[PDB]
Design an enzyme around this catalytic site. Structure first.
Site, short mmCIF file in Angstrom:
data_model
loop_
_atom_site.label_atom_id
_atom_site.label_comp_id
_atom_site.label_asym_id
_atom_site.label_seq_id
_atom_site.Cartn_x
_atom_site.Cartn_y
_atom_site.Cartn_z
N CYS A 64 -45.25 77.99 -38.09
CA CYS A 64 -45.68 79.19 -37.37
C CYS A 64 -44.56 80.17 -37.10
CB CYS A 64 -46.31 78.81 -36.02
SG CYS A 64 -47.27 77.32 -36.06
N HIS A 105 -46.27 83.87 -28.30
CA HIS A 105 -46.79 83.07 -29.40
C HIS A 105 -48.25 82.73 -29.15
CE1 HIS A 105 -47.01 79.23 -31.87
NE2 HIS A 105 -46.71 80.17 -32.74
N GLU A 144 -45.25 77.51 -23.33
CA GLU A 144 -44.70 78.86 -23.44
C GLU A 144 -44.58 79.53 -22.07
OE1 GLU A 144 -46.72 81.62 -26.07
OE2 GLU A 144 -44.94 82.91 -26.09
N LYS A 203 -53.00 86.63 -30.89
CA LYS A 203 -53.86 85.67 -31.56
C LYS A 203 -55.25 85.63 -30.93
CE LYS A 203 -50.05 82.69 -33.26
NZ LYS A 203 -48.99 83.63 -32.73
N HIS A 210 -54.46 82.96 -35.89
CA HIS A 210 -53.19 82.37 -36.29
C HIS A 210 -53.11 82.39 -37.81
CE1 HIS A 210 -49.57 80.20 -36.22
NE2 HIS A 210 -49.92 79.10 -35.56
N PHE A 217 -44.82 74.60 -35.35
CA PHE A 217 -44.91 73.16 -35.55
C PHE A 217 -43.62 72.64 -36.17
CE2 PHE A 217 -49.46 74.53 -35.94
CZ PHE A 217 -49.89 73.97 -34.73
C1 LIG Z 1 -54.79 81.57 -42.01
C2 LIG Z 1 -55.07 80.47 -43.04
C3 LIG Z 1 -53.91 79.49 -43.19
C4 LIG Z 1 -54.24 78.40 -44.22
S1 LIG Z 1 -52.81 77.34 -44.60
O1 LIG Z 1 -51.90 77.21 -43.46
O2 LIG Z 1 -53.23 75.99 -44.96
N1 LIG Z 1 -51.85 78.05 -45.79
C5 LIG Z 1 -52.17 78.09 -47.19
C6 LIG Z 1 -51.11 78.38 -48.06
C7 LIG Z 1 -51.35 78.44 -49.42
C8 LIG Z 1 -52.64 78.22 -49.92
C9 LIG Z 1 -53.20 78.24 -51.24
N2 LIG Z 1 -54.49 77.96 -51.13
N3 LIG Z 1 -54.80 77.78 -49.83
C10 LIG Z 1 -56.13 77.46 -49.33
C11 LIG Z 1 -53.69 77.94 -49.06
C12 LIG Z 1 -53.46 77.87 -47.66
NA NA Z 2 -45.82 86.79 -30.56
#
Ligand SMILES: CCCCS(=O)(=O)Nc1ccc2cnn(C)c2c1
Ligand code: NA
Ligand SMILES: CCCCS(=O)(=O)Nc1ccc2cnn(C)c2c1
Ligand SMILES: CCCCS(=O)(=O)Nc1ccc2cnn(C)c2c1
Ligand SMILES: CCCCS(=O)(=O)Nc1ccc2cnn(C)c2c1
Ligand code: NA
Lengths: 414, 414
Positions: free
Chosen positions: A169, A309, A320, A338, A343, A402
């Site tokens: 994050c 955050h 926080e 957020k 997020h 995290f």
């Molecule tokens: C706001 C959504 C965040 C989803 S995530 O943290 O799991 N990052 C994420 C990064 C790359 C890819 C490619 N496909 N996908 C599904 C992805 C997902």
């Molecule tokens: Na912020």
């Protein structure tokens, strides 16, 4: 000991911003919507929600999907985060007036949470189907998490460093921190920096849901993200990517660019506490805020605004609140974006850094959505109801990722 | 303008090193083997070579597999690179005399090329089999590329920043660069830094082979990696992970630690040239060497030794020869350790940084294996035949990663 205030560090300004969010592809339209109390978070229409009967049925997809701007070629040669980086990189440069800069004094720092991960599964399926020679010669450059930053550095011609910090994050805020370092240490005069992140799909929902980190208020999606509210129950995904252009004040003046704000200092600390839970006492996270003040040359009393955050997890918002108090900043006016934008992990610190710039530029803080019954154990001045117009001189943007990665960015009104 | 030589930066020393390689789990035994002309590269015995009939049938697995030190618990709660990081972190701390340091002045910076990628496929299989609730609540913390650094920071108690730079082949060197920055900017007094990387398997071989980046000299595995040799035909995988302990000279003196070398400066630039090929002219890569000299306070004539990136690709070694010349360092005695240890991507810059320290400590450079018919278009003083004992005062370790990321680390004899 050098500081921005005492001239020990060169003055660094923010000269352009760009972002794509669940509210709008245009940052100024996102900003207008936030002020109007809009939320990007809705009921997920995706087939995969019904297919898996996920606990979480809400989130904010980008208002304008990245791939609606991608032709066949880009869809074959780049991972999703690279496509989003290429899109934002070109938008940012145009918004900056397409300057001609010295490539040898031009850096790129773009964080991301994961990288081109969908191309890992695809390459592995292609090989199971047709053997090793049906893996693309482009597979490595699409998979590698440095790929989005490399795409942007190649697109814009940055030859003073192309870097990718990964800190969940806090990735997008840490990227802006290292871009600031690259300038103040003398390695660069101008930098594109921020974060990109992938889209909402079923596996990401399952993975974060199994930590009980996510809200399940599916009946009222826009009400689900409730940072610092007594009734919060976790975070909501809201897709985003964001970049900003920073450069020395002298560089900006010499090419006629009007700064939107100043980037004054950056603090990076760590909890060394737990792999996903933040430290309850907020001490190291507060120390990151303090460190950004030390490098800026400010005291806690100068801090008019904290862009929290604020993920709306029970333990995260409580930690926080302790951190802000530890840093002596609890008289500051607090915004938790957020609440409206959700997020976006590796992008969100960059997005919230842009929002902090805009708060300083326009002297206004949007309302924290869904802040209705303030948590009794948290006593912060959370902006809510409608935007608060105020004389904000200095602000800190917080990102606590995290893994225990704490980044605080100190910004000033230009 | 501050430099290490003129006291503008605090003096930073290397006080402990640890590494696991295809030659040995003990760094001092790896070092002894290198001097004796040993190679870690052999015929791959793995079933997957026959299953896919891979073009590449050679490589160097770790002499001592990481998981031979991992019980059932660690095998369930950590990705491979986290397990390797936990192993090396504890070995390093013990080798350092298990000091009690101030956690608030203690940073961790550990690069890696990819992250916990095998847990992505596993989580996706578990969900296809049994739905979203059969994804582990540990999945996020195992997958995230910051996970190895977070594990080490949590294991050793580092609360002055836990960072993960991702820059392919330069990740482990860039990590040492940012650890040096974190100390000289005043955020930390001591840092564990380096890189970890995953093992050789079929998909990684297929992916890099499809760029024609890899040697196919399967008949004579120990002869296949031939950096700067006229008959080279690409790189060879050699598994590795490596960490070093750095700290201010005052910190080291106050706790009785004997420095093995000095870490004097670090240069980070970028090619902005091509997604995987290095720039032929070597200019930005040479500029990274120059920058490390500027920050150290050295001139090119002070550089007695260059630990080359030297992957043995045709275009990579040619670009690096231009870079060394561009930096004015082509009178230096050159070692290409990938000739013996192969390429470990995100770990290799850290491994080669340890080897550079040991070269300075012991006044000796191991022979570059397989350097038999020097490439006519490359004119470098490549150490070969047997170790060269010499009066090495200063050295630069080069790492030039896919994506165009150039890192040069300037080291000095203590
Ligand atoms: C706001 C959504 C965040 C989803 S995530 O943290 O799991 N990052 C994420 C990064 C790359 C890819 C490619 N496909 N996908 C599904 C992805 C997902
Ligand atoms: Na912020
Ligand atoms: C396409 C596969 C998606 C992998 S996932 O569903 O497990 N999400 C995921 C997991 C860990 C991290 C760390 N940073 N970030 C962004 C993450 C994202
Ligand atoms: C010296 C070998 C380098 C192989 S690689 O560059 O493809 N990194 C790598 C990283 C993580 C994992 C997990 N499983 N596997 C197979 C991995 C591989
Ligand atoms: C377990 C899946 C392995 C994914 S892979 O076979 O395609 N190798 C791989 C690909 C890209 C990069 C960048 N850095 N690094 C280390 C990489 C490694
Ligand atoms: Na090297």
């Amino acid at each position: 000991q050098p500081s921005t205030a005492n001239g020990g560090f060169p003055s660094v300004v923010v000269t352009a911003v760009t972002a794509t969010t669940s509210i709008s592809p245009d940052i100024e339209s996102t900003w207008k919507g936030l002020l109007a109390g809009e939320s990007g978070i809705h009921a997920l229409e995706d087939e995969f929600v019904t297919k898996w009967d996920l606990a979480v049925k809400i989130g904010g997809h980008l208002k304008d999907p990245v791939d609606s701007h991608m032709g066949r070629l880009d869809m074959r040669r780049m991972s999703y985060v690279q496509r989003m980086g290429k899109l934002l990189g070109g938008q940012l440069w145009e918004s900056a007036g397409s300057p001609e800069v010295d490539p040898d004094r031009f850096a790129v720092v773009v964080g991301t949470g994961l990288g081109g991960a969908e191309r890992i599964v695809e390459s592995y399926d292609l090989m199971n189907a047709g053997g090793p020679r049906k893996v693309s010669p482009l597979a490595v450059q699409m998979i590698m998490p440095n790929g989005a930053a490399a795409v942007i550095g190649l697109q814009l011609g940055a030859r003073a460093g192309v870097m990718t910090p990964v800190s969940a994050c806090s990735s997008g805020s840490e990227a802006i921190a290292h871009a600031w370092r690259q300038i103040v240490m003398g390695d660069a005069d101008v930098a594109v920096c921020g974060g990109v992140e992938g889209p909402i799909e079923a596996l990401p929902i399952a993975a974060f849901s199994m930590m009980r980190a996510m809200s399940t208020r599916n009946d009222e999606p826009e009400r689900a993200s409730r940072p610092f509210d007594k009734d919060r129950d976790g975070f909501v995904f809201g897709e985003a990517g964001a970049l900003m252009l920073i450069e020395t004040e002298e560089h900006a003046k010499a090419r006629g660019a009007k700064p939107l704000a100043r980037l004054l200092g950056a603090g990076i600390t760590s909890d060394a506490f737990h792999m996903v839970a933040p430290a309850a006492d907020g001490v190291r996270a507060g120390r990151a805020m303090t460190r950004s003040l030390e490098l800026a040359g400010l005291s806690p009393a100068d801090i008019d605004h904290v862009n929290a955050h604020g993920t709306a997890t029970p333990i995260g918002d409580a930690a926080e609140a302790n951190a802000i108090r530890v840093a002596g900043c609890d008289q500051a006016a607090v915004y938790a974006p957020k609440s409206a934008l959700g997020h976006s992990i590796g992008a969100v610190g960059a997005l919230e850094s842009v929002l902090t710039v805009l708060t300083l530029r326009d002297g206004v803080i949007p309302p924290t959505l869904n802040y209705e019954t303030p948590d009794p154990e948290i006593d912060l001045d959370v902006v809510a109801g409608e935007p608060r117009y105020g004389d904000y001189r200095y602000a800190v943007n917080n990102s606590f990722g995290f893994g225990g990665h704490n980044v605080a960015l100190a910004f000033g009104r230009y």
